[PDB]
Amino acid sequence: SMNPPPPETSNPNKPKRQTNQLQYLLRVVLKTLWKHQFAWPFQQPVDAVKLNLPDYYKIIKTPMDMGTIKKRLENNYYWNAQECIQDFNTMFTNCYIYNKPGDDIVLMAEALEKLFLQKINELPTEE
Ligand SMILES: O=C1CC=CN1c1cccc(NS(=O)(=O)c2cccc(Br)c2)c1
């Protein structure tokens, strides 16, 4: 399509672990953000066709979204929490790259990011 293949959510040869922090990221961090009133644009990969953003994947070369992150967590895709947190960071950063300060979508991302920051502050220690 005008859309690239979505980011993988499984990769059999990638090393992975379950850690208490990754569990936390799924059951609390992801879950909380997912139910937020501003979550909906971020619950799936950007559909450049449907949303009429033909320039999106000209600009964003490392796409990420909470839908991909959710599956990745459900599929135990990650080696550690930092890998997952990086995916969240990429998603926010993409939004701030593609869009303008004060855009509705940026306001939504900003709200989610500050909530994200609160929630990872409460991340349980790891070993
Ligand atoms: O950059 C990202 C990351 C996730 C979605 N987007 C994004 C960015 C620009 C436009 C749109 N299209 S839209 O229909 O979802 C839309 C339009 C106007 C306001 C709001 Br809120 C939402 C989506």
Side-chain angles (χ1 to χ4, degrees):
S1 102
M2 202 180 252
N3 296 314
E8 72 188 6
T9 56
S10 61
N11 183 334
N13 273 326
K14 179 184 186 304
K16 40 192 68 94
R17 298 184 304 191
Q18 196 164 14
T19 74
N20 63 319
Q21 297 195 326
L22 280 170
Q23 242 156 332
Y24 193 75
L25 280 167
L26 176 62
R27 290 327 188 184
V28 176
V29 178
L30 189 280
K31 277 308 179 336
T32 295
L33 265 64
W34 191 266
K35 307 189 175 192
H36 194 278
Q37 61 204 84
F38 292 163
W40 58 269
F42 303 94
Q43 286 172 332
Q44 62 284 311
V46 171
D47 184 336
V49 182
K50 179 190 181 173
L51 307 179
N52 193 17
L53 313 173
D55 60 350
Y56 187 79
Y57 291 108
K58 308 306 185 190
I59 299 165
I60 301 303
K61 295 319 185 75
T62 310
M64 185 58 54
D65 65 282
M66 295 204 296
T68 298
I69 295 170
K70 182 173 181 291
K71 288 175 194 162
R72 285 184 174 191
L73 289 166
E74 290 170 352
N75 294 345
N76 300 306
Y77 175 88
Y78 300 111
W79 176 258
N80 61 20
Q82 184 51 46
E83 288 189 345
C84 180
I85 291 163
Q86 181 54 76
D87 280 345
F88 275 99
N89 285 339
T90 297
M91 178 188 71
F92 295 125
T93 292
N94 290 346
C95 185
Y96 306 145
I97 288 177
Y98 177 73
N99 303 283
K100 304 282 182 170
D103 285 352
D104 276 345
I105 188 61
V106 172
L107 297 180
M108 281 172 150
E110 285 172 344
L112 295 183
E113 186 182 6
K114 77 216 192 197
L115 185 48
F116 177 69
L117 290 170
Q118 297 186 23
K119 287 313 197 175
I120 59 179
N121 183 50
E122 81 194 23
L123 202 69
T125 92
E126 177 262 337
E127 37 287 327

Short mmCIF file of all heavy atoms in Angstrom, two decimals, residues 42-101:
data_model
loop_
_atom_site.label_atom_id
_atom_site.label_comp_id
_atom_site.label_asym_id
_atom_site.label_seq_id
_atom_site.Cartn_x
_atom_site.Cartn_y
_atom_site.Cartn_z
N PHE A 42 -2.90 6.50 18.76
CA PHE A 42 -1.66 5.77 18.99
C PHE A 42 -1.87 4.27 19.20
O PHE A 42 -0.92 3.55 19.51
CB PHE A 42 -0.93 6.39 20.18
CG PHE A 42 -0.64 7.86 19.99
CD1 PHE A 42 -1.50 8.82 20.49
CD2 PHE A 42 0.48 8.27 19.28
CE1 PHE A 42 -1.25 10.16 20.29
CE2 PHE A 42 0.74 9.61 19.07
CZ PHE A 42 -0.13 10.56 19.59
N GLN A 43 -3.10 3.80 19.03
CA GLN A 43 -3.40 2.38 19.27
C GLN A 43 -3.11 1.46 18.08
O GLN A 43 -3.37 0.25 18.15
CB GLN A 43 -4.86 2.22 19.70
CG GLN A 43 -5.15 2.68 21.13
CD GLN A 43 -6.63 2.71 21.46
OE1 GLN A 43 -7.47 2.88 20.59
NE2 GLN A 43 -6.95 2.53 22.74
N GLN A 44 -2.58 2.01 17.00
CA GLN A 44 -2.27 1.22 15.80
C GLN A 44 -1.28 1.97 14.92
O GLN A 44 -1.14 3.19 15.04
CB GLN A 44 -3.54 0.91 15.00
CG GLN A 44 -4.27 2.17 14.48
CD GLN A 44 -5.03 2.88 15.57
OE1 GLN A 44 -5.78 2.26 16.32
NE2 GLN A 44 -4.83 4.19 15.68
N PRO A 45 -0.59 1.26 14.01
CA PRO A 45 0.31 2.00 13.11
C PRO A 45 -0.42 3.10 12.34
O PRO A 45 -1.61 2.97 12.04
CB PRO A 45 0.81 0.91 12.15
CG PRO A 45 0.73 -0.35 12.94
CD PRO A 45 -0.48 -0.20 13.83
N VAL A 46 0.30 4.17 12.05
CA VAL A 46 -0.25 5.27 11.27
C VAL A 46 -0.66 4.72 9.91
O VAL A 46 0.14 4.09 9.21
CB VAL A 46 0.75 6.42 11.09
CG1 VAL A 46 0.22 7.44 10.09
CG2 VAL A 46 1.06 7.08 12.44
N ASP A 47 -1.93 4.93 9.56
CA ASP A 47 -2.44 4.53 8.26
C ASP A 47 -2.41 5.76 7.38
O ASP A 47 -3.35 6.56 7.41
CB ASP A 47 -3.85 3.96 8.39
CG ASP A 47 -4.41 3.43 7.07
OD1 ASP A 47 -3.97 3.88 5.99
OD2 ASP A 47 -5.32 2.58 7.12
N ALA A 48 -1.34 5.90 6.60
CA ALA A 48 -1.11 7.08 5.76
C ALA A 48 -2.19 7.27 4.70
O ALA A 48 -2.45 8.39 4.27
CB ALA A 48 0.26 6.97 5.08
N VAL A 49 -2.79 6.16 4.27
CA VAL A 49 -3.85 6.18 3.28
C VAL A 49 -5.15 6.72 3.87
O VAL A 49 -5.70 7.73 3.39
CB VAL A 49 -4.09 4.77 2.69
CG1 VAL A 49 -5.16 4.81 1.60
CG2 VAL A 49 -2.79 4.21 2.15
N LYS A 50 -5.64 6.04 4.90
CA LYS A 50 -6.89 6.42 5.55
C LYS A 50 -6.86 7.83 6.12
O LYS A 50 -7.84 8.56 6.02
CB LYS A 50 -7.24 5.44 6.68
CG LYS A 50 -8.52 5.81 7.41
CD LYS A 50 -8.74 4.99 8.67
CE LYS A 50 -10.05 5.36 9.34
NZ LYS A 50 -10.37 4.47 10.49
N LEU A 51 -5.75 8.21 6.74
CA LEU A 51 -5.64 9.51 7.40
C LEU A 51 -5.19 10.61 6.43
O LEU A 51 -5.00 11.76 6.85
CB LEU A 51 -4.66 9.44 8.58
CG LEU A 51 -4.96 8.33 9.59
CD1 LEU A 51 -3.92 8.34 10.70
CD2 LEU A 51 -6.36 8.45 10.16
N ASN A 52 -5.03 10.27 5.15
CA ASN A 52 -4.58 11.23 4.14
C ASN A 52 -3.29 11.94 4.55
O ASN A 52 -3.21 13.17 4.56
CB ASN A 52 -5.68 12.26 3.86
CG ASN A 52 -5.40 13.08 2.61
OD1 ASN A 52 -4.57 12.70 1.78
ND2 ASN A 52 -6.07 14.22 2.48
N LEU A 53 -2.28 11.15 4.90
CA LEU A 53 -0.94 11.65 5.19
C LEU A 53 0.07 11.04 4.23
O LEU A 53 0.92 10.24 4.65
CB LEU A 53 -0.54 11.32 6.64
CG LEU A 53 -1.57 11.60 7.73
CD1 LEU A 53 -1.10 11.06 9.08
CD2 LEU A 53 -1.89 13.10 7.82
N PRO A 54 0.01 11.42 2.95
CA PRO A 54 0.90 10.75 1.99
C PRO A 54 2.37 11.00 2.28
O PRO A 54 3.21 10.24 1.82
CB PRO A 54 0.49 11.37 0.64
CG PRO A 54 -0.12 12.70 1.01
CD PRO A 54 -0.82 12.46 2.32
N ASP A 55 2.69 12.04 3.05
CA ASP A 55 4.08 12.35 3.34
C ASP A 55 4.61 11.64 4.58
O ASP A 55 5.80 11.72 4.88
CB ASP A 55 4.27 13.87 3.50
CG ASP A 55 3.43 14.45 4.62
OD1 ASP A 55 2.55 13.74 5.16
OD2 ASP A 55 3.64 15.64 4.94
N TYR A 56 3.75 10.91 5.28
CA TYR A 56 4.13 10.44 6.61
C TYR A 56 5.35 9.53 6.58
O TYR A 56 6.31 9.73 7.32
CB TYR A 56 2.98 9.72 7.30
CG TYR A 56 3.33 9.40 8.74
CD1 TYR A 56 3.24 10.39 9.73
CD2 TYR A 56 3.79 8.15 9.11
CE1 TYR A 56 3.57 10.12 11.06
CE2 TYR A 56 4.12 7.86 10.44
CZ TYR A 56 4.02 8.85 11.41
OH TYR A 56 4.35 8.58 12.73
N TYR A 57 5.34 8.54 5.71
CA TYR A 57 6.44 7.60 5.68
C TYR A 57 7.58 8.06 4.77
O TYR A 57 8.54 7.32 4.53
CB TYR A 57 5.93 6.22 5.28
CG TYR A 57 5.07 5.61 6.38
CD1 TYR A 57 3.69 5.50 6.24
CD2 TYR A 57 5.65 5.18 7.57
CE1 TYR A 57 2.91 4.95 7.25
CE2 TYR A 57 4.88 4.63 8.58
CZ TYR A 57 3.52 4.52 8.42
OH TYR A 57 2.76 3.97 9.44
N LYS A 58 7.48 9.29 4.27
CA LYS A 58 8.62 9.97 3.67
C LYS A 58 9.45 10.60 4.78
O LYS A 58 10.65 10.83 4.63
CB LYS A 58 8.19 11.06 2.69
CG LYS A 58 7.20 10.61 1.64
CD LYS A 58 7.72 9.43 0.89
CE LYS A 58 6.80 9.05 -0.25
NZ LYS A 58 7.23 7.74 -0.79
N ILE A 59 8.78 10.89 5.89
CA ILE A 59 9.39 11.63 6.99
C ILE A 59 9.75 10.71 8.14
O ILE A 59 10.85 10.79 8.70
CB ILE A 59 8.43 12.75 7.47
CG1 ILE A 59 8.17 13.73 6.31
CG2 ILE A 59 9.00 13.46 8.70
CD1 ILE A 59 6.98 14.67 6.53
N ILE A 60 8.83 9.81 8.49
CA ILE A 60 9.03 8.90 9.60
C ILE A 60 9.53 7.54 9.09
O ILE A 60 8.78 6.81 8.47
CB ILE A 60 7.72 8.70 10.39
CG1 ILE A 60 7.22 10.05 10.92
CG2 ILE A 60 7.92 7.74 11.55
CD1 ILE A 60 8.23 10.77 11.78
N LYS A 61 10.80 7.23 9.37
CA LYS A 61 11.41 6.00 8.86
C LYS A 61 11.49 4.92 9.93
O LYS A 61 11.80 3.75 9.63
CB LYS A 61 12.81 6.30 8.30
CG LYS A 61 12.81 7.20 7.08
CD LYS A 61 11.67 6.82 6.14
CE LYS A 61 11.70 7.63 4.85
NZ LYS A 61 12.78 7.17 3.93
N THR A 62 11.23 5.29 11.17
CA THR A 62 11.16 4.31 12.26
C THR A 62 9.82 4.44 12.97
O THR A 62 9.74 4.98 14.07
CB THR A 62 12.33 4.48 13.25
OG1 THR A 62 13.56 4.55 12.53
CG2 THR A 62 12.39 3.31 14.23
N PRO A 63 8.74 3.95 12.33
CA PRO A 63 7.40 4.07 12.90
C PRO A 63 7.25 3.23 14.15
O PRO A 63 7.90 2.19 14.27
CB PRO A 63 6.47 3.54 11.79
CG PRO A 63 7.35 3.25 10.61
CD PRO A 63 8.75 3.17 11.07
N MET A 64 6.43 3.70 15.09
CA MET A 64 6.07 2.90 16.25
C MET A 64 4.76 3.42 16.84
O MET A 64 4.43 4.60 16.71
CB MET A 64 7.20 2.93 17.29
CG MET A 64 6.97 2.04 18.50
SD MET A 64 6.72 0.30 18.08
CE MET A 64 8.18 -0.05 17.09
N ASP A 65 4.02 2.52 17.47
CA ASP A 65 2.68 2.80 17.98
C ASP A 65 2.40 1.87 19.15
O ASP A 65 3.08 0.84 19.30
CB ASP A 65 1.65 2.59 16.89
CG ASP A 65 1.59 1.13 16.46
OD1 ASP A 65 2.48 0.70 15.70
OD2 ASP A 65 0.69 0.41 16.94
N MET A 66 1.42 2.21 19.98
CA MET A 66 1.12 1.39 21.16
C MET A 66 0.51 0.05 20.79
O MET A 66 0.51 -0.88 21.61
CB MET A 66 0.19 2.13 22.12
CG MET A 66 0.80 3.36 22.73
SD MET A 66 0.00 3.79 24.29
CE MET A 66 -1.66 4.16 23.75
N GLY A 67 -0.04 -0.06 19.59
CA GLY A 67 -0.63 -1.31 19.16
C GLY A 67 0.49 -2.32 18.97
O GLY A 67 0.41 -3.46 19.44
N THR A 68 1.54 -1.88 18.29
CA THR A 68 2.73 -2.70 18.10
C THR A 68 3.38 -3.04 19.45
O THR A 68 3.78 -4.19 19.69
CB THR A 68 3.74 -1.98 17.18
OG1 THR A 68 3.15 -1.79 15.88
CG2 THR A 68 5.04 -2.78 17.05
N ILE A 69 3.46 -2.05 20.33
CA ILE A 69 4.08 -2.27 21.64
C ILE A 69 3.28 -3.28 22.45
O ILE A 69 3.86 -4.17 23.06
CB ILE A 69 4.21 -0.94 22.42
CG1 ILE A 69 5.19 -0.01 21.69
CG2 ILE A 69 4.71 -1.21 23.84
CD1 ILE A 69 5.22 1.42 22.24
N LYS A 70 1.96 -3.15 22.43
CA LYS A 70 1.08 -4.07 23.15
C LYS A 70 1.29 -5.51 22.71
O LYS A 70 1.44 -6.40 23.54
CB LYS A 70 -0.38 -3.67 22.94
CG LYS A 70 -1.41 -4.52 23.67
CD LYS A 70 -2.79 -3.88 23.51
CE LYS A 70 -3.88 -4.65 24.24
NZ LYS A 70 -4.13 -5.97 23.59
N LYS A 71 1.28 -5.74 21.40
CA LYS A 71 1.54 -7.09 20.89
C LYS A 71 2.93 -7.57 21.29
O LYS A 71 3.09 -8.71 21.72
CB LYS A 71 1.40 -7.14 19.37
CG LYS A 71 -0.01 -7.03 18.86
CD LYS A 71 -0.03 -6.96 17.34
CE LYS A 71 -1.38 -6.52 16.81
NZ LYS A 71 -1.28 -6.03 15.41
N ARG A 72 3.92 -6.70 21.14
CA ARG A 72 5.29 -7.04 21.52
C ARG A 72 5.36 -7.48 22.98
O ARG A 72 6.01 -8.47 23.30
CB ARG A 72 6.23 -5.87 21.25
CG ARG A 72 6.53 -5.68 19.78
CD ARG A 72 7.54 -4.58 19.52
NE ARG A 72 7.91 -4.52 18.11
CZ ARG A 72 8.92 -3.81 17.62
NH1 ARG A 72 9.68 -3.07 18.42
NH2 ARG A 72 9.17 -3.83 16.31
N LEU A 73 4.67 -6.76 23.85
CA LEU A 73 4.63 -7.14 25.26
C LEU A 73 3.87 -8.45 25.44
O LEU A 73 4.32 -9.33 26.17
CB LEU A 73 4.01 -6.03 26.10
CG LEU A 73 4.87 -4.78 26.25
CD1 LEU A 73 4.03 -3.62 26.80
CD2 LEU A 73 6.07 -5.05 27.16
N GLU A 74 2.73 -8.59 24.78
CA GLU A 74 1.94 -9.82 24.90
C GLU A 74 2.69 -11.03 24.33
O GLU A 74 2.48 -12.16 24.79
CB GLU A 74 0.59 -9.66 24.19
CG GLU A 74 -0.36 -8.71 24.92
CD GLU A 74 -1.59 -8.37 24.11
OE1 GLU A 74 -1.66 -8.73 22.91
OE2 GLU A 74 -2.50 -7.72 24.67
N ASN A 75 3.57 -10.78 23.37
CA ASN A 75 4.33 -11.85 22.72
C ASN A 75 5.70 -12.07 23.34
O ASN A 75 6.50 -12.86 22.83
CB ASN A 75 4.53 -11.54 21.23
CG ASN A 75 3.23 -11.56 20.45
OD1 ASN A 75 2.22 -12.05 20.93
ND2 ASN A 75 3.27 -11.02 19.24
N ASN A 76 5.98 -11.35 24.43
CA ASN A 76 7.27 -11.43 25.11
C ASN A 76 8.44 -11.17 24.15
O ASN A 76 9.40 -11.92 24.11
CB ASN A 76 7.43 -12.79 25.80
CG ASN A 76 6.35 -13.04 26.83
OD1 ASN A 76 6.14 -12.23 27.74
ND2 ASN A 76 5.64 -14.15 26.69
N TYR A 77 8.33 -10.09 23.38
CA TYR A 77 9.26 -9.79 22.30
C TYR A 77 10.59 -9.22 22.78
O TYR A 77 11.63 -9.39 22.14
CB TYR A 77 8.58 -8.81 21.34
CG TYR A 77 9.43 -8.27 20.20
CD1 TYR A 77 9.52 -8.95 18.99
CD2 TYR A 77 10.08 -7.05 20.32
CE1 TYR A 77 10.28 -8.45 17.95
CE2 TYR A 77 10.83 -6.54 19.29
CZ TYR A 77 10.93 -7.24 18.10
OH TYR A 77 11.67 -6.72 17.07
N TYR A 78 10.55 -8.55 23.94
CA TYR A 78 11.68 -7.79 24.43
C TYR A 78 12.68 -8.58 25.27
O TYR A 78 12.34 -9.59 25.89
CB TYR A 78 11.17 -6.63 25.27
CG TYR A 78 10.29 -5.67 24.52
CD1 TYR A 78 8.93 -5.58 24.80
CD2 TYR A 78 10.82 -4.82 23.56
CE1 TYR A 78 8.11 -4.68 24.13
CE2 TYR A 78 10.01 -3.91 22.88
CZ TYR A 78 8.66 -3.85 23.18
OH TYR A 78 7.85 -2.95 22.52
N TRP A 79 13.91 -8.09 25.31
CA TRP A 79 14.94 -8.65 26.18
C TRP A 79 14.91 -7.96 27.55
O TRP A 79 15.17 -8.59 28.59
CB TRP A 79 16.32 -8.48 25.54
CG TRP A 79 17.45 -8.94 26.39
CD1 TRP A 79 18.30 -8.16 27.14
CD2 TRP A 79 17.87 -10.29 26.59
NE1 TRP A 79 19.22 -8.96 27.78
CE2 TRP A 79 18.98 -10.27 27.46
CE3 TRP A 79 17.41 -11.52 26.11
CZ2 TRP A 79 19.64 -11.44 27.86
CZ3 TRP A 79 18.07 -12.68 26.51
CH2 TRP A 79 19.17 -12.63 27.38
N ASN A 80 14.58 -6.68 27.55
CA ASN A 80 14.54 -5.92 28.79
C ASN A 80 13.59 -4.72 28.70
O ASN A 80 13.10 -4.39 27.61
CB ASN A 80 15.95 -5.47 29.20
CG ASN A 80 16.61 -4.56 28.18
OD1 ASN A 80 15.95 -3.94 27.34
ND2 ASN A 80 17.93 -4.45 28.28
N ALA A 81 13.36 -4.08 29.83
CA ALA A 81 12.43 -2.95 29.87
C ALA A 81 12.92 -1.82 28.99
O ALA A 81 12.11 -1.12 28.37
CB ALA A 81 12.23 -2.47 31.31
N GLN A 82 14.23 -1.61 28.92
CA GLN A 82 14.76 -0.46 28.18
C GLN A 82 14.39 -0.54 26.69
O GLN A 82 14.08 0.48 26.05
CB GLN A 82 16.28 -0.36 28.35
CG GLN A 82 16.89 0.87 27.68
CD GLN A 82 16.20 2.17 28.06
OE1 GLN A 82 15.91 2.43 29.23
NE2 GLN A 82 15.90 2.99 27.05
N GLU A 83 14.40 -1.75 26.14
CA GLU A 83 13.93 -1.96 24.77
C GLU A 83 12.49 -1.49 24.58
O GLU A 83 12.18 -0.86 23.57
CB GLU A 83 14.03 -3.43 24.36
CG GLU A 83 15.44 -3.92 24.12
CD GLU A 83 15.47 -5.32 23.51
OE1 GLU A 83 14.43 -6.01 23.54
OE2 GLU A 83 16.53 -5.73 23.00
N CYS A 84 11.63 -1.80 25.54
CA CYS A 84 10.23 -1.37 25.45
C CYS A 84 10.07 0.14 25.62
O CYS A 84 9.34 0.78 24.87
CB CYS A 84 9.38 -2.08 26.51
SG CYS A 84 7.63 -1.60 26.45
N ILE A 85 10.76 0.69 26.61
CA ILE A 85 10.74 2.13 26.84
C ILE A 85 11.23 2.87 25.59
O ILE A 85 10.70 3.93 25.23
CB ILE A 85 11.58 2.50 28.08
CG1 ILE A 85 10.88 1.97 29.33
CG2 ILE A 85 11.80 4.00 28.16
CD1 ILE A 85 11.77 1.89 30.57
N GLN A 86 12.22 2.30 24.90
CA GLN A 86 12.70 2.90 23.66
C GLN A 86 11.59 2.98 22.62
O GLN A 86 11.48 3.98 21.90
CB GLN A 86 13.89 2.14 23.09
CG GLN A 86 14.44 2.77 21.80
CD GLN A 86 14.79 4.25 21.95
OE1 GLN A 86 15.81 4.60 22.54
NE2 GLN A 86 13.93 5.13 21.42
N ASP A 87 10.77 1.94 22.52
CA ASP A 87 9.67 1.95 21.57
C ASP A 87 8.70 3.08 21.89
O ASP A 87 8.26 3.78 21.00
CB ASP A 87 8.94 0.61 21.55
CG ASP A 87 9.68 -0.44 20.73
OD1 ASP A 87 10.59 -0.05 19.96
OD2 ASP A 87 9.36 -1.64 20.87
N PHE A 88 8.38 3.25 23.17
CA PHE A 88 7.52 4.37 23.56
C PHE A 88 8.14 5.69 23.15
O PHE A 88 7.46 6.56 22.58
CB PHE A 88 7.25 4.36 25.06
CG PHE A 88 6.10 3.48 25.47
CD1 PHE A 88 6.34 2.21 25.97
CD2 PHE A 88 4.79 3.93 25.38
CE1 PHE A 88 5.29 1.39 26.35
CE2 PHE A 88 3.73 3.13 25.76
CZ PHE A 88 3.99 1.85 26.25
N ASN A 89 9.43 5.85 23.43
CA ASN A 89 10.13 7.09 23.09
C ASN A 89 10.10 7.37 21.59
O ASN A 89 9.90 8.51 21.18
CB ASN A 89 11.57 7.03 23.58
CG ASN A 89 11.69 7.22 25.07
OD1 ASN A 89 10.78 7.75 25.71
ND2 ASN A 89 12.81 6.79 25.64
N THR A 90 10.31 6.33 20.79
CA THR A 90 10.25 6.48 19.34
C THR A 90 8.88 6.98 18.89
O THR A 90 8.77 7.85 18.01
CB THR A 90 10.55 5.14 18.63
OG1 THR A 90 11.89 4.72 18.94
CG2 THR A 90 10.39 5.27 17.13
N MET A 91 7.83 6.44 19.49
CA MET A 91 6.46 6.82 19.14
C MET A 91 6.22 8.31 19.44
O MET A 91 5.71 9.04 18.60
CB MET A 91 5.46 5.96 19.89
CG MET A 91 4.00 6.31 19.63
SD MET A 91 2.88 5.41 20.72
CE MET A 91 3.21 6.23 22.29
N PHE A 92 6.60 8.75 20.63
CA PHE A 92 6.44 10.16 20.97
C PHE A 92 7.29 11.03 20.04
O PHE A 92 6.80 12.01 19.49
CB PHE A 92 6.82 10.41 22.44
CG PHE A 92 5.90 9.74 23.40
CD1 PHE A 92 6.39 8.88 24.38
CD2 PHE A 92 4.53 9.93 23.32
CE1 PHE A 92 5.54 8.24 25.26
CE2 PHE A 92 3.67 9.30 24.19
CZ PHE A 92 4.17 8.45 25.17
N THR A 93 8.54 10.65 19.87
CA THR A 93 9.48 11.43 19.06
C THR A 93 8.97 11.58 17.62
O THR A 93 9.00 12.69 17.05
CB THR A 93 10.89 10.80 19.09
OG1 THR A 93 11.44 10.94 20.41
CG2 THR A 93 11.82 11.48 18.10
N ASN A 94 8.47 10.49 17.04
CA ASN A 94 7.88 10.55 15.70
C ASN A 94 6.80 11.62 15.62
O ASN A 94 6.72 12.37 14.65
CB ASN A 94 7.27 9.21 15.30
CG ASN A 94 8.32 8.14 15.03
OD1 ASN A 94 9.51 8.45 14.89
ND2 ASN A 94 7.89 6.88 14.96
N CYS A 95 5.96 11.67 16.64
CA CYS A 95 4.86 12.60 16.65
C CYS A 95 5.37 14.04 16.66
O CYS A 95 4.80 14.91 15.98
CB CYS A 95 3.95 12.33 17.83
SG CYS A 95 2.45 13.34 17.86
N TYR A 96 6.43 14.29 17.43
CA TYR A 96 6.99 15.64 17.55
C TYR A 96 7.80 16.02 16.31
O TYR A 96 7.98 17.19 16.02
CB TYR A 96 7.86 15.76 18.82
CG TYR A 96 7.13 15.34 20.08
CD1 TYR A 96 7.80 14.69 21.12
CD2 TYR A 96 5.77 15.57 20.22
CE1 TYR A 96 7.12 14.31 22.27
CE2 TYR A 96 5.09 15.19 21.36
CZ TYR A 96 5.76 14.56 22.38
OH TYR A 96 5.06 14.19 23.50
N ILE A 97 8.29 15.02 15.58
CA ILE A 97 8.99 15.29 14.32
C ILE A 97 8.01 15.66 13.19
O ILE A 97 8.21 16.64 12.47
CB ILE A 97 9.82 14.07 13.86
CG1 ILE A 97 11.06 13.90 14.74
CG2 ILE A 97 10.23 14.22 12.39
CD1 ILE A 97 11.89 12.68 14.41
N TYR A 98 6.96 14.86 13.05
CA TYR A 98 6.07 14.98 11.91
C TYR A 98 5.14 16.18 12.02
O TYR A 98 4.79 16.81 11.02
CB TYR A 98 5.23 13.70 11.74
CG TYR A 98 4.24 13.78 10.60
CD1 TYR A 98 4.66 13.73 9.28
CD2 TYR A 98 2.88 13.92 10.85
CE1 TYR A 98 3.75 13.83 8.23
CE2 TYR A 98 1.96 14.01 9.82
CZ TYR A 98 2.40 13.97 8.51
OH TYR A 98 1.50 14.07 7.48
N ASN A 99 4.75 16.50 13.25
CA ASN A 99 3.72 17.50 13.50
C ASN A 99 4.27 18.80 14.08
O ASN A 99 5.44 18.89 14.41
CB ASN A 99 2.66 16.93 14.44
CG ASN A 99 2.04 15.66 13.90
OD1 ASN A 99 1.19 15.71 13.00
ND2 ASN A 99 2.45 14.52 14.46
N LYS A 100 3.40 19.81 14.19
CA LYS A 100 3.79 21.12 14.72
C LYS A 100 3.43 21.29 16.19
O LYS A 100 2.40 20.80 16.64
CB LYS A 100 3.12 22.24 13.91
CG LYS A 100 3.39 22.20 12.42
CD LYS A 100 4.77 22.76 12.09
CE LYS A 100 5.00 22.77 10.58
NZ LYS A 100 6.23 23.53 10.21
N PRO A 101 4.28 22.00 16.95
CA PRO A 101 3.93 22.36 18.33
C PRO A 101 2.52 22.94 18.40
O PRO A 101 2.16 23.79 17.59
CB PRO A 101 4.98 23.41 18.68
CG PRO A 101 6.17 23.00 17.88
CD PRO A 101 5.63 22.46 16.58
#
